[PDB]
Amino acid sequence: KLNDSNLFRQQALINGEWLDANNGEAIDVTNPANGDKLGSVPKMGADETRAAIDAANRALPAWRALTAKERATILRNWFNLMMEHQDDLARLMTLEQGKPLAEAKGEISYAASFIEWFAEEGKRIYGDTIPGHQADKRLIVIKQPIGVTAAITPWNFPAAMITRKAGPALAAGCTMVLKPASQTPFSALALAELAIRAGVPAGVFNVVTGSAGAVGNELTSNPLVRKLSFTGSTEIGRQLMEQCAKDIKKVSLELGGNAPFIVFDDADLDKAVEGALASKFRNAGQTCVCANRLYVQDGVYDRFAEKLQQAMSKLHIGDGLDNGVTIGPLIDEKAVAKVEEHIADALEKGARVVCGGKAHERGGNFFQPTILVDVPANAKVSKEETFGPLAPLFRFKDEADVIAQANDTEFGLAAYFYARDLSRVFRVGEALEYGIVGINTGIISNEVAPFGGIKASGLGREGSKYGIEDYLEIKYMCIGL
Amino acid sequence: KLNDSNLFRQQALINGEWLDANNGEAIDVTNPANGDKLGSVPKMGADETRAAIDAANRALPAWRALTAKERATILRNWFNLMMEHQDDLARLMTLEQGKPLAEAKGEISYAASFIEWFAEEGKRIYGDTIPGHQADKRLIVIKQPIGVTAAITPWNFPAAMITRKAGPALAAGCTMVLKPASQTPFSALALAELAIRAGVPAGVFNVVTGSAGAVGNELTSNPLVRKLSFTGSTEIGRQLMEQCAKDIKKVSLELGGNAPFIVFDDADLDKAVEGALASKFRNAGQTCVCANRLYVQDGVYDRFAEKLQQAMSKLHIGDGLDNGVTIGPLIDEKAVAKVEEHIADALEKGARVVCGGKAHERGGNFFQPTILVDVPANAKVSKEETFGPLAPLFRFKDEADVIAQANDTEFGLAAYFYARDLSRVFRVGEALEYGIVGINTGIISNEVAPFGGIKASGLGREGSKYGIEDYLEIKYMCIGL
Amino acid sequence: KLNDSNLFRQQALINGEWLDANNGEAIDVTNPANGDKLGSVPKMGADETRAAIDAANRALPAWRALTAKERATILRNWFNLMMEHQDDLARLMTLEQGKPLAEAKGEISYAASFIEWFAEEGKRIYGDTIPGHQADKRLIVIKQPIGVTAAITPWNFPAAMITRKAGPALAAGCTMVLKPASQTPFSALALAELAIRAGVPAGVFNVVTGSAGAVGNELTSNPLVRKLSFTGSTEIGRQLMEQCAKDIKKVSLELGGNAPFIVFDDADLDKAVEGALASKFRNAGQTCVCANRLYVQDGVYDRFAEKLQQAMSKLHIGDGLDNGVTIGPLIDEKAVAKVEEHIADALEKGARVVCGGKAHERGGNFFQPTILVDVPANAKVSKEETFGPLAPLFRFKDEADVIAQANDTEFGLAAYFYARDLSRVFRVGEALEYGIVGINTGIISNEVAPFGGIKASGLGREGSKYGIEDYLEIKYMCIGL
Amino acid sequence: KLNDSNLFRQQALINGEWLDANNGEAIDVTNPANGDKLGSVPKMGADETRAAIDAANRALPAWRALTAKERATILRNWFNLMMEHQDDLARLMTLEQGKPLAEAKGEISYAASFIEWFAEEGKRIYGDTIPGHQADKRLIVIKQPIGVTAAITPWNFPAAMITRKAGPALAAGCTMVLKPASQTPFSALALAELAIRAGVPAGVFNVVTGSAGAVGNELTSNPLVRKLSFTGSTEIGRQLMEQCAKDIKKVSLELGGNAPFIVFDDADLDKAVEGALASKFRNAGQTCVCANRLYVQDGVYDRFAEKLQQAMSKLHIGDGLDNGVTIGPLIDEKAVAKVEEHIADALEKGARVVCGGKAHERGGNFFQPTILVDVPANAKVSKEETFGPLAPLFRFKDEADVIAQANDTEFGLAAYFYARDLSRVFRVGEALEYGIVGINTGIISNEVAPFGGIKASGLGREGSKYGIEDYLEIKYMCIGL
Ligand SMILES: NC(=O)c1ccc[n+]([C@@H]2O[C@H](COP(=O)([O-])OP(=O)(O)OC[C@H]3O[C@@H](n4cnc5c(N)ncnc54)[C@H](OP(=O)(O)O)[C@@H]3O)[C@@H](O)[C@H]2O)c1
Ligand SMILES: NC(=O)c1ccc[n+]([C@@H]2O[C@H](COP(=O)([O-])OP(=O)(O)OC[C@H]3O[C@@H](n4cnc5c(N)ncnc54)[C@H](OP(=O)(O)O)[C@@H]3O)[C@@H](O)[C@H]2O)c1
């Protein structure tokens, strides 16, 4: 398999040391395309996690004390190494998580861009001087690393989730203990390996593998951890925020979404269809910003449905390492069951399957890209994140009406719409209750803009100048002359 | 009492209406100097709070839709009214909370400044344009009001605590339901009255008085509330943050502090003493940023102690309405009990009373300005928040030792130090784990600088350009050409 | 006359004293509507200007040394006084410059807004801290007043031109010597009077009246003057910039414009006509941002021309003090002469007058609002600033053609266009070589956005956070630990 | 000689082509250490410069149209190449300009950092959105490249002067025509060569060699050039600013300095001496920020003078290619003469040579580091830029006195002072009329902070987030809904 075999790691990284769990237990990792065992990863608990936090704390003063340029040098080394080893990293990711190799290569590039961006940002952590309240007073604001930080990351973007958190943390001058998804830990550990090679000192970046709560409970209850960042389900987000209350930790969360994708009568339809295909079926729909509800205005509903159906039959389901495959398997059978459930629920409420609608002939974790039409506003899918390759099409008549429908949810991460009228664009863009709004495009991803949710969708922002804020503390100094 | 009798309110403000509780129950409010009943306020519960939230929700679109200048006009009217009625407002505050009239006048001025500052800041909510990731993409960031907000405020700064939250909320384009302290609600309600007179529309700013549980539980559990701001004890902060997890609310907290006040060998000792007197004994020590631990270097310990004792003998205890009174009573008998406990604890651990030491001859809520020496680091008085006119005094050797001692706490709000050497000032200023650092000054309060805590001391900042951020949501728009 | 007779001043203000010229010579000021003498102002020269500069220099340390808040108090007093005396100030302006009373009241309000805006901005002059290049280095940037400043202002906006320069100068902590237009000096002197009443100290703001080059030569050659701001003709801009080279003065310039006004096929035509009317005929076309060239796409040319002609009928010419008058006289005979020359030049090159086109029946400085068609691109009116009620109409074919035509000029001040298509709006908005671009609106004026030109049109910006920059010097401080 | 022989170029670079002058005339370049001919560069004039401007103009749309990241990729390649070829570039520079090899290597590294920094800054050109003046208005500010730019650079920092201007220009999206110093053109042309290798397209960066005004007259009179940046003498700065007035060009200037270096009673003397040695004798005192006047307080004057004299023994004069040489030759005989003239005027006015005092035994351009004492304020050296290894020592009594003396000059570039007292540091730091202030350090150079002068010392800033502003135009767009 790999050009560089040392990128494949079956041990956790704590304080510069590759280690097994104290008790020797491991978690098996399997290939979602076929069920084959790829390897394993330590099943760590509180004790190893505690040791990792103590290592992060011990390494903090010396990391914090480096110049921004010397941190930038190390981080840029990390970035360069990621790009150098791109092919191996992509292969590793396809094997453990399932997405097509081209998608995985794209993710490596995107993931790496966070390391580069924040290396640069670290040199631009600006304080302020503020005109004084009295002639004999001087006011200075500085921004300093929050300290030891914890990160919990999901399985759907096994590389980019890491770098979206480690990038700003390390560039801020913080240290980090990261717990990657048990289903896709290899990508995280490979990045850890490249961090060593880049010159990241022992204890500055630690990767601890184990079962959800064992590691997580220690991360949220240890007062040395001053900041937690989590990406995943809304329910676990709730529990983690509750747990963080004891120490009044600063918490960043990127949670559930239920993205509306809105096509107005004045849209460029071919572009809407391309946007919809890219937005819905990226990572087989296993994305927090995937179109989950497709609202199409009555004037263009029939034409759009036809074009979308034409475009969808062109997708190739298969093993993500094979030529021309554009839809891989879902992560597990639990993901499949949810897609199945959403389809059944839409049917019981009067929707019609136009195409797909069932598990793929391959079985296992493979599901057919599917289109539902005549989907009513009371359907589960209208309220609940699908996380799979299902396009449900909601009809609409009126702009005010669709805005009300789009916003009628506790979530508020990404939304998309297609329209050409300037005034319409402003009205809809402004009225949508979402943290991210794609306008005439289905692909919004980059490292330079703030990515995050409002409402039940989360707290804080990732990427951009705003992204590093969450890892800093403001200090106000008032000097008496 | 008052020049304008209509400033004294004994009813809550909901949706522009002055109301009693539905069940007509009231909370009595007494004068802490003597125990006299001043009046009462409604004892509202979930029902009235719910109705207030619904009013704030209803009022939000039209408030949000005003220009920043028209919001500024209304807020500047409120500011001007506060300053016009300064004398009445100060009197009202002295009567209900106890502080000397001059301190109350000072607080009105400071409280009002937040309204003015944020009126101005509202016009300066700047979005961004960011260079695109592709030639056919445009990136725009806008900042919009988070929506309906809740505020819970304490008794120690009965006017400033209101304006530090209502100012940025309203200027951001949010609406607000505020629950003021049951011991000092009149200040809040007078401000409410002036908000009506200023042109603040019905439902934009609501003040609900009642039991903490009954009002607070509704604030934290109603999903229409998207943001909570609280100032008070660390334990209630923990509970409120837990409760906010359900809706993933944005939370601002300003909590406990245990402020170290550090005097180095090279300090101006007369200035250090002045700063210590101002910092420790302001509001009789009932301040979240009050000096709570006095660290004085070996070389100057004896001289500082002598000078401090000279300066303190000049302190005058009495009714806050009387000439020359500089120490008023504490807020209630439990305030006294805590101070008494901290003394008892330090003595049992081998400390010495240098002056004060017990409850004043007047009795009731009055307490003797107290200094302790020979206090060990594990004493209640040096680990917990005292909120009384009691200071332990510590000797230290050098820079390294005192920094370690200063930072050896779960808190992180304010710290102070006195030194003249430039290098020392940077070293100590940077090393202190506090959100606020006073350097050669004991008074750091203003509206223009970010005020808040790190660690267990809070989340978010109040005042300054950063203050309004906590009430805004960032929206990223990506336009496809 | 006036409600407050002391607003009418016939003396200059130097160092808090109302003075005549040393030689007692005066400049007569006449009413452009009828030629009546209104009064006179001192005809000052180098001597009095030098004394004004010395007074500004002398007052600088104490003005600079005030807190931002105390400068804000004084400037807000000035703002408030301007609004209080709005009616008198508007009357005074209509009498001396000619514009309709409603336009003059509008200008007072707009002029005043600069004083308020900058009073606020003075409190928000932010320095920086920058991460250091070495561990033992600290980098701090502060912004300080440039020092003594000079302002030269034109006759077309006799109040707003003052406040757009004095506002940011005084808020920055600078002092100022201002030379107003000889044709409209009363508005400037009234403002000066209000500055006294507001608490602006002697020598902080001085108004010297006199003949262009005598006062100007002293302003540009005196090394105590560190900054010059000028609004007027391009040719005088060139000369003043040349003169400022000796001392390497910081120079702000707002110069000539030749504003294209572009109407696309997909425009809302009624809104385009309304915008065109407002943009072209405001201040009788005597505005640096007035539509000077009207480009209308082939598909809508005929309809637009018809509608514009209908709308122009409801403009009423007369004395600006009379009810319903919407076009006053031009400033003088020379202005009438330039409009006649533009029309004559157009006609001899094949142009055709649609309506108007001759001096008004009243004579003097009154001119008929005029539409010209068949105007060649080599016509004086398509190349030069007209500053009169003259609307030439240009046909166009496609977007790329009109952009090339709009940009084919040395000027680059304001441009306007009307379109509904989102992509078109971006393409055109981005490609126009102008400092200010109105999109689907003819009225772009406010204090909060940066106003200024590119190319031969000027240097620097007025209004906004960028406006105060031109009156500050950046100071970089590098501290060695 | 060089590792990479193609770095040594004897032709100009215009539109991607290496060219001789139209008339084949060349300028000889000699080694200042011995007078040897190194080679020559074209003696170009108006015609070639005009062709270069046309080439820059032609290349602008496609350079402007790239994404910020693709410009960053090209610029980072340039940076990397500079660091890769550091040894050759350093050698080339030492040969043509004379400075020690270690100084030259340091300049290459410093010069390269501007290219890196601005590559990063280009991705961070932020526009704004501003809250509207009316509910139906939206305000957007964008920042766009100013267009074709011209740069004129001096001989003292033959690499860093180029990159300080080309860096921000190209990162802004501008194109550039650069005229390097005729005495040190090879460094510029080598950088040009690496720009080709980096992927900088033809016409984006042009280097035209020629003698002063020939090239300069065309740069300043050609209206396609919209921005000029110049570093050199004050007198040429004045002339260039005058010439730029015709087109109202945006002008950046870094001119003469006369840096005061102030040592207070409470300074660390050994550190002051080290700082003074580094500040005064870097590049043999041929730097715009070199200490030119040494003010030492009465209490420490004698001790400082003794220590400075001891330290001046650590200076080793010779060929910059030889081991341990720390002072090279001056640039030419005219430089030697000016130093001899300053010493003579100082002695004529009563000053005394403590050490050195005349040309170095080698002759040619070699001069002895000199200390003067007993220097009066009327000496030329107190008013004029020496640009040579001459340290004059002034005695001062107190703070107010030295501040007044320091500021008593038309210059305002760099100043330095040594003091430990916090209050003193603020007082003096704030009161100094300089763009750059070193505090307890003699070395202030970096790419992250704004570098530039006030008063007659310049316009604009180089390095930092501010550095790019001078190369952008602000565009205000106002959208009507
Ligand atoms: N991009 C996203 O915002 C995102 C990502 C993933 C899932 N989801 C949503 O969640 C749904 C299904 O849930 P899921 O199982 O994939 O995600 P989940 O339960 O929210 O878990 C996400 C990650 O958090 C860890 N985790 C769970 N509970 C924890 C705890 N108490 N303490 C510490 N860590 C804990 C898990 O670790 P283990 O791997 O060890 O179990 C997992 O890697 C999906 O269908 C999707 O809608 C969203
Ligand atoms: N860092 C600085 O601010 C700096 C730098 C250099 C000099 N100086 C000052 O000037 C003195 C040295 O004299 P200098 O002859 O080197 O100074 P200068 O006359 O200002 O020359 C500086 C550079 O600008 C070029 N130049 C001069 N006039 C020009 C014009 N009209 N158009 C276009 N380019 C023009 C020259 O090119 P050519 O080589 O082709 O003649 C030279 O390389 C020093 O003693 C110092 O005080 C200061």
PDB file of C-alpha atoms in Angstrom, chain B residues 121-250:
ATOM      1  CA  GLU B 121     -20.437  51.034  18.535  1.00  0.00           C
ATOM      2  CA  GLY B 122     -23.728  50.010  16.851  1.00  0.00           C
ATOM      3  CA  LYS B 123     -22.765  52.215  13.899  1.00  0.00           C
ATOM      4  CA  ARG B 124     -19.426  50.358  13.651  1.00  0.00           C
ATOM      5  CA  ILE B 125     -20.452  46.723  13.328  1.00  0.00           C
ATOM      6  CA  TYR B 126     -18.099  45.967  10.423  1.00  0.00           C
ATOM      7  CA  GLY B 127     -18.451  42.959   8.131  1.00  0.00           C
ATOM      8  CA  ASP B 128     -15.639  41.865   5.827  1.00  0.00           C
ATOM      9  CA  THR B 129     -14.918  41.062   2.247  1.00  0.00           C
ATOM     10  CA  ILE B 130     -12.221  38.355   1.935  1.00  0.00           C
ATOM     11  CA  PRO B 131     -10.200  37.505  -1.214  1.00  0.00           C
ATOM     12  CA  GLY B 132     -11.830  34.513  -2.924  1.00  0.00           C
ATOM     13  CA  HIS B 133     -10.559  30.952  -3.130  1.00  0.00           C
ATOM     14  CA  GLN B 134     -11.490  30.910  -6.849  1.00  0.00           C
ATOM     15  CA  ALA B 135     -11.721  33.669  -9.463  1.00  0.00           C
ATOM     16  CA  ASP B 136     -15.484  33.184  -9.829  1.00  0.00           C
ATOM     17  CA  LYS B 137     -16.210  33.346  -6.088  1.00  0.00           C
ATOM     18  CA  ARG B 138     -16.795  36.283  -3.734  1.00  0.00           C
ATOM     19  CA  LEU B 139     -16.615  36.128   0.042  1.00  0.00           C
ATOM     20  CA  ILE B 140     -18.591  38.423   2.327  1.00  0.00           C
ATOM     21  CA  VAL B 141     -18.978  38.314   6.107  1.00  0.00           C
ATOM     22  CA  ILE B 142     -21.777  40.176   7.891  1.00  0.00           C
ATOM     23  CA  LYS B 143     -22.607  40.324  11.609  1.00  0.00           C
ATOM     24  CA  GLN B 144     -26.215  40.210  12.728  1.00  0.00           C
ATOM     25  CA  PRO B 145     -27.971  40.369  16.142  1.00  0.00           C
ATOM     26  CA  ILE B 146     -28.084  36.966  17.843  1.00  0.00           C
ATOM     27  CA  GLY B 147     -31.795  37.621  18.630  1.00  0.00           C
ATOM     28  CA  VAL B 148     -33.635  37.436  21.971  1.00  0.00           C
ATOM     29  CA  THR B 149     -31.241  37.722  24.893  1.00  0.00           C
ATOM     30  CA  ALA B 150     -31.502  37.182  28.645  1.00  0.00           C
ATOM     31  CA  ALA B 151     -29.532  38.948  31.357  1.00  0.00           C
ATOM     32  CA  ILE B 152     -29.240  38.083  35.067  1.00  0.00           C
ATOM     33  CA  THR B 153     -27.613  40.774  37.207  1.00  0.00           C
ATOM     34  CA  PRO B 154     -26.281  40.939  40.803  1.00  0.00           C
ATOM     35  CA  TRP B 155     -26.766  43.467  43.669  1.00  0.00           C
ATOM     36  CA  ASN B 156     -23.281  44.967  43.975  1.00  0.00           C
ATOM     37  CA  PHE B 157     -23.419  47.265  40.938  1.00  0.00           C
ATOM     38  CA  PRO B 158     -27.206  47.627  40.532  1.00  0.00           C
ATOM     39  CA  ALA B 159     -26.972  50.092  37.567  1.00  0.00           C
ATOM     40  CA  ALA B 160     -23.662  49.263  35.825  1.00  0.00           C
ATOM     41  CA  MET B 161     -24.477  45.526  35.592  1.00  0.00           C
ATOM     42  CA  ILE B 162     -27.683  46.383  33.696  1.00  0.00           C
ATOM     43  CA  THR B 163     -26.084  48.770  31.156  1.00  0.00           C
ATOM     44  CA  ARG B 164     -23.004  46.552  30.555  1.00  0.00           C
ATOM     45  CA  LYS B 165     -25.468  44.005  29.094  1.00  0.00           C
ATOM     46  CA  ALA B 166     -28.438  46.011  27.774  1.00  0.00           C
ATOM     47  CA  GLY B 167     -26.080  48.493  26.039  1.00  0.00           C
ATOM     48  CA  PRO B 168     -24.377  46.016  23.673  1.00  0.00           C
ATOM     49  CA  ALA B 169     -27.520  43.862  23.272  1.00  0.00           C
ATOM     50  CA  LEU B 170     -29.717  46.718  22.082  1.00  0.00           C
ATOM     51  CA  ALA B 171     -26.942  48.280  19.973  1.00  0.00           C
ATOM     52  CA  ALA B 172     -26.371  44.917  18.311  1.00  0.00           C
ATOM     53  CA  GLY B 173     -30.057  44.922  17.343  1.00  0.00           C
ATOM     54  CA  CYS B 174     -31.092  42.337  19.965  1.00  0.00           C
ATOM     55  CA  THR B 175     -33.999  42.477  22.370  1.00  0.00           C
ATOM     56  CA  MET B 176     -33.676  41.683  26.084  1.00  0.00           C
ATOM     57  CA  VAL B 177     -35.410  40.206  29.135  1.00  0.00           C
ATOM     58  CA  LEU B 178     -33.468  41.223  32.232  1.00  0.00           C
ATOM     59  CA  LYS B 179     -33.795  39.771  35.742  1.00  0.00           C
ATOM     60  CA  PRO B 180     -32.194  42.109  38.338  1.00  0.00           C
ATOM     61  CA  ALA B 181     -31.112  41.206  41.881  1.00  0.00           C
ATOM     62  CA  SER B 182     -34.056  40.866  44.310  1.00  0.00           C
ATOM     63  CA  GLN B 183     -32.091  42.878  46.904  1.00  0.00           C
ATOM     64  CA  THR B 184     -31.499  45.861  44.556  1.00  0.00           C
ATOM     65  CA  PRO B 185     -34.259  45.909  41.918  1.00  0.00           C
ATOM     66  CA  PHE B 186     -35.205  49.596  42.067  1.00  0.00           C
ATOM     67  CA  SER B 187     -32.102  50.741  40.241  1.00  0.00           C
ATOM     68  CA  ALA B 188     -32.990  48.385  37.384  1.00  0.00           C
ATOM     69  CA  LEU B 189     -36.597  49.521  37.220  1.00  0.00           C
ATOM     70  CA  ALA B 190     -35.635  53.213  37.224  1.00  0.00           C
ATOM     71  CA  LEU B 191     -33.379  52.511  34.232  1.00  0.00           C
ATOM     72  CA  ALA B 192     -36.383  50.735  32.650  1.00  0.00           C
ATOM     73  CA  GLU B 193     -38.473  53.853  33.209  1.00  0.00           C
ATOM     74  CA  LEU B 194     -35.854  56.040  31.515  1.00  0.00           C
ATOM     75  CA  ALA B 195     -35.728  53.542  28.613  1.00  0.00           C
ATOM     76  CA  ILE B 196     -39.464  54.192  28.045  1.00  0.00           C
ATOM     77  CA  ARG B 197     -38.855  57.957  28.160  1.00  0.00           C
ATOM     78  CA  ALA B 198     -35.921  57.572  25.738  1.00  0.00           C
ATOM     79  CA  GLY B 199     -38.113  55.916  23.073  1.00  0.00           C
ATOM     80  CA  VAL B 200     -37.137  52.269  23.557  1.00  0.00           C
ATOM     81  CA  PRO B 201     -40.127  50.474  21.974  1.00  0.00           C
ATOM     82  CA  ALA B 202     -42.366  48.094  23.915  1.00  0.00           C
ATOM     83  CA  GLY B 203     -40.805  44.651  24.331  1.00  0.00           C
ATOM     84  CA  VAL B 204     -37.252  45.599  23.343  1.00  0.00           C
ATOM     85  CA  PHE B 205     -36.134  45.911  26.987  1.00  0.00           C
ATOM     86  CA  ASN B 206     -38.058  44.068  29.705  1.00  0.00           C
ATOM     87  CA  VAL B 207     -37.294  43.860  33.395  1.00  0.00           C
ATOM     88  CA  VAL B 208     -38.752  40.928  35.292  1.00  0.00           C
ATOM     89  CA  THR B 209     -38.441  40.689  39.056  1.00  0.00           C
ATOM     90  CA  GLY B 210     -38.927  37.413  40.908  1.00  0.00           C
ATOM     91  CA  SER B 211     -37.413  34.320  42.475  1.00  0.00           C
ATOM     92  CA  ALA B 212     -34.111  33.191  40.979  1.00  0.00           C
ATOM     93  CA  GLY B 213     -35.328  29.657  40.271  1.00  0.00           C
ATOM     94  CA  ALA B 214     -38.729  30.553  38.810  1.00  0.00           C
ATOM     95  CA  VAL B 215     -37.414  33.334  36.484  1.00  0.00           C
ATOM     96  CA  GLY B 216     -33.977  31.846  35.669  1.00  0.00           C
ATOM     97  CA  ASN B 217     -35.254  28.369  34.801  1.00  0.00           C
ATOM     98  CA  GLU B 218     -37.556  29.906  32.194  1.00  0.00           C
ATOM     99  CA  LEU B 219     -34.770  32.109  30.773  1.00  0.00           C
ATOM    100  CA  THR B 220     -32.412  29.104  30.350  1.00  0.00           C
ATOM    101  CA  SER B 221     -34.994  26.587  29.079  1.00  0.00           C
ATOM    102  CA  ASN B 222     -36.941  28.714  26.583  1.00  0.00           C
ATOM    103  CA  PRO B 223     -35.435  28.141  23.082  1.00  0.00           C
ATOM    104  CA  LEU B 224     -36.492  31.627  21.984  1.00  0.00           C
ATOM    105  CA  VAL B 225     -33.656  32.893  24.214  1.00  0.00           C
ATOM    106  CA  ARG B 226     -30.474  32.518  22.152  1.00  0.00           C
ATOM    107  CA  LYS B 227     -28.040  34.249  24.443  1.00  0.00           C
ATOM    108  CA  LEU B 228     -27.583  34.497  28.222  1.00  0.00           C
ATOM    109  CA  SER B 229     -25.381  36.916  30.109  1.00  0.00           C
ATOM    110  CA  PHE B 230     -24.834  36.452  33.855  1.00  0.00           C
ATOM    111  CA  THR B 231     -22.802  38.208  36.551  1.00  0.00           C
ATOM    112  CA  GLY B 232     -22.584  36.566  39.988  1.00  0.00           C
ATOM    113  CA  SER B 233     -21.164  33.595  41.856  1.00  0.00           C
ATOM    114  CA  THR B 234     -19.149  30.862  40.178  1.00  0.00           C
ATOM    115  CA  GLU B 235     -21.520  28.126  41.349  1.00  0.00           C
ATOM    116  CA  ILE B 236     -24.610  29.776  39.788  1.00  0.00           C
ATOM    117  CA  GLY B 237     -22.545  30.418  36.647  1.00  0.00           C
ATOM    118  CA  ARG B 238     -21.864  26.656  36.473  1.00  0.00           C
ATOM    119  CA  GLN B 239     -25.565  25.812  36.872  1.00  0.00           C
ATOM    120  CA  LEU B 240     -26.660  28.420  34.294  1.00  0.00           C
ATOM    121  CA  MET B 241     -24.105  27.182  31.740  1.00  0.00           C
ATOM    122  CA  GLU B 242     -25.324  23.593  32.267  1.00  0.00           C
ATOM    123  CA  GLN B 243     -28.918  24.699  31.730  1.00  0.00           C
ATOM    124  CA  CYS B 244     -27.974  26.581  28.552  1.00  0.00           C
ATOM    125  CA  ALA B 245     -26.511  23.418  27.007  1.00  0.00           C
ATOM    126  CA  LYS B 246     -29.941  22.163  25.941  1.00  0.00           C
ATOM    127  CA  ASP B 247     -30.344  24.901  23.300  1.00  0.00           C
ATOM    128  CA  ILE B 248     -26.584  25.419  22.757  1.00  0.00           C
ATOM    129  CA  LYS B 249     -27.098  29.042  23.860  1.00  0.00           C
ATOM    130  CA  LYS B 250     -24.266  31.535  23.571  1.00  0.00           C
TER     131      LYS B 250
END
